[PDB]
Design a protein around this ligand. Structure first.
Ligand SMILES: Nc1ncnc2c1ncn2[C@@H]1O[C@H](COP(=O)(O)OP(=O)(O)O)[C@@H](O)[C@H]1O
Ligand SMILES: Nc1ncnc2c1ncn2[C@@H]1O[C@H](COP(=O)(O)OP(=O)(O)O)[C@@H](O)[C@H]1O
Ligand SMILES: C[N+](C)(C)CCCCCCCCCC[N+](C)(C)C
Ligand SMILES: C[N+](C)(C)CCCCCCCCCC[N+](C)(C)C
Ligand SMILES: CCCNC(=O)[C@H](O)[C@@H](O)C(=O)O
Ligand SMILES: CCCNC(=O)[C@H](O)[C@@H](O)C(=O)O
Ligand SMILES: [Mg+2]
Ligand SMILES: [Mg+2]
Ligand SMILES: [Mg+2]
Lengths: 358, 357
């Protein structure tokens, strides 16, 4: 109801108390996937002329308590959109007014390096902040999430309501080797993890966004801002970066089925990647890091490995009223996993143990 | 007078009307050089909780206050410069950009370096990509006019006899050659400029900041902002870029004579400079430009020549409260020679020995 949202807004949003409802417009947006979102603006020419009204819907092994807990922190250290009012059934957020980057704009060098700078600022919070919540899992999520979403997929598949059983089946086999592949012949341990960090900040443990795609990067007047932290959690730095690199391939701004376009060749070239990683490290390490340095050369090729984590994760996720062909999209991510793995091999990036330690 | 500043603030700043005077603090800052600046804050925990109160002072012969104000208001209106909350004949109320100034060392940091290149690019394109760009702003570059204008202001001061006469004298001789050196064997002309642009965006005519040093770059929560546009005006893109590069050398945060430190070797390395212009070009051109590409290899070399404009402009400016303007001048002059000497030894000069090949 509009009047109920307007009453809630004038009561809780500083400055809105005395504003007549006739100057307030509530307009629901349906670009979301779970919650009821509204942009509430003041139409008469206030620190907050526009706000984002979020009402929690029921989400499709998902824990809403942890996601909210993480968001409130990020909101408090001023990374995520500011929280103006916070209640059980929803919240009032600062409206980040800007245009979401396009898939093509990612190719632009000035845009690329700004995101790498932002990702870096977000990554270091778990090691450079005294106020970092201790209760947040200190272990990477990449594997847990995959196993968790793998099981959700099975359930849906058994629901049998049209997937490429041959591809899907091969992916289920690959998952068994997935840890050895990322950890270079060894299964995951916090031990293996700390040792790997010694070789490349790619295996550094950071607080990752985990879904930093172009539609989650808003281009404001003076900067680009990140949104949608629903998948944010500690993870290998390389995982988060490789995922961003992958979104270079997927354009979700299509109006005809399957309602997304993909171009494998669009995956960012090696030079662009190195510029990204140089700026990233300059940010996380606070020192002059440039593409010609060996820490970049190593990390760039290491980050390539984590690209498979992205294709598999969002594949299973895609399987686990709005226009999107989730099944066809999963087929694509899986397809690209196979392809990328062949490339990493032919390029000598896989297996890790054949170069990383030399 | 505090009370007077607070009256003007409460009356003109949205939301401040009913705020009690006891919640407002006016504290004057003295980092400036000409005007009376105040940071007015609401000490009780508003769109504008802090503002900048600027009172216009009398500027030190050919200075034009009307053109500067005219240019600032436009920049403020298109949201690049600090917002203007209230604008009157004797001063303004500015949006207070709350952030810390960059340090001279911080410029070396790659992530910082590329944000300024991006920011510079956004500012540079306003003369070609904005329909509302004022037609009344000079369309010619200012580099030479300024050097000549300030040369004459220097003459005056020198005669006032109150400096290194051997260097100063050599510098005056070099100026006569300056146009040919920058335009590759020719004196300046608009058509000569249009021709040069075809060879490198270094000779592109843009709206330059012209004094983009670390102290004019403030780090906010989410980005680095540019301030102090009193020298802004059309110019060769390369000049503005080469000036930023030069500031890598000079640190004005020193409290002992001569109140500034300098390290010639701190000039940004070639790789960093290329990183800079790649990001710059991508912003101005809106395409994927990277250090590998030829357009960069060439512009970066061209940009190196404009460094001499920077050393000379500010050396003269220095001649024309704690600061030793005389020693600073000797320094920029000493570096002009040193740099010009290196440019020649590197084959960068003269431009006509390569640029057109
Ligand atoms: N704080 C905000 N400011 C501006 N736009 C927002 C904000 N939050 C969401 N949006 C818009 O709506 C979308 C956010 O949806 P999302 O939070 O992903 O919904 P759901 O939680 O249902 O997945 C973004 O793509 C963006 O376009
Ligand atoms: N809008 C602003 N917000 C925050 N700080 C400012 C603002 N304007 C000026 N300052 C600070 O005041 C200093 C002096 O400003 P400037 O305009 O150079 O003074 P002057 O015009 O007297 O030279 C700047 O270096 C900057 O640190
Ligand atoms: C974008 N517009 C507004 C046109 C519509 C968005 C429709 C939902 C997007 C489908 C989910 C794909 C996301 C894939 N990952 C999670 C990998 C980003
Ligand atoms: C940083 N603090 C506030 C302590 C010094 C401010 C006053 C320093 C005097 C200006 C020095 C000349 C500037 C040279 N150019 C114009 C080339 C930057
Ligand atoms: C194209 C819209 C962007 N969406 C996403 O990144 C996620 O898949 C979205 O569904 C979400 O739940 O955040
Ligand atoms: C060190 C701060 C001063 N920097 C400058 O470029 C000048 O002071 C300029 O701001 C001026 O006011 O002339
Ligand atoms: Mg969403
Ligand atoms: Mg994408
Ligand atoms: Mg400097």
């Amino acid at each position: 109801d509009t009047e109920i949202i307007i009453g809630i807004c004038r009561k809780n949003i500083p400055g809105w108390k005395e504003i007549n409802e006739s100057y307030i417009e509530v307009k629901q947006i349906f670009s979301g996937l779970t919650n009821q979102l509204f942009v509430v603006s003041i139409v008469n020419e206030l620190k907050h002329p526009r706000i984002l009204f979020r009402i929690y819907g029921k989400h499709v092994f998902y824990d809403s308590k942890v996601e909210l807990d993480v968001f409130r922190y990020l909101s408090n250290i001023n990374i995520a959109p500011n929280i103006i009012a916070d209640f059980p059934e929803g919240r009032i957020e600062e409206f980040i007014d800007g245009e979401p980057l396009t898939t093509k704009q990612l190719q632009l060098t000035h845009i690329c390096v700004e995101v790498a700078k932002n990702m870096g600022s977000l990554h270091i919070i778990n090691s450079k902040r005294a106020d970092f919540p201790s209760r947040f899992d200190k272990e990477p999520i990449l594997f847990k999430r995959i196993y968790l979403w793998r099981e959700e997929a099975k359930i849906q598949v058994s629901k049998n309501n049209q997937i490429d059983k041959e591809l899907y089946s091969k992916i289920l086999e690959e998952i068994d080797q997935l840890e050895e592949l990322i950890m270079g012949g060894e299964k995951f341990s916090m031990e293996r993890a700390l040792e790997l960090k010694l070789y490349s900040p790619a295996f550094s443990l950071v607080f990752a966004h985990n879904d930093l795609q172009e539609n989650n990067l808003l281009q404001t007047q003076n900067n680009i801002r990140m949104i949608d932290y629903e998948y944010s959690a500690i993870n290998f730095a390389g995982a988060d970066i490789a995922n961003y690199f992958c979104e270079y391939i997927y354009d979700y701004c299509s109006e005809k089925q399957p309602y997304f376009k993909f171009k494998y060749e669009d995956y960012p070239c090696e030079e662009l990647r190195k510029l990204f990683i140089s700026v990233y490290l300059s940010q996380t390490l606070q020192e002059q890091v440039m593409p010609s340095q060996q820490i970049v050369h190593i990390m760039t090729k290491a980050v390539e490995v984590f690209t498979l984590i992205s294709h598999i994760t969002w594949g299973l996720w895609s399987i686990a009223s709005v226009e999107f062909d989730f099944t066809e999209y999963a087929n694509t991510r899986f397809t690209h996993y196979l392809q990328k793995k062949k490339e990493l091999i032919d390029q000598g990036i896989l297996p890790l143990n054949s170069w990383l330690f030399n």
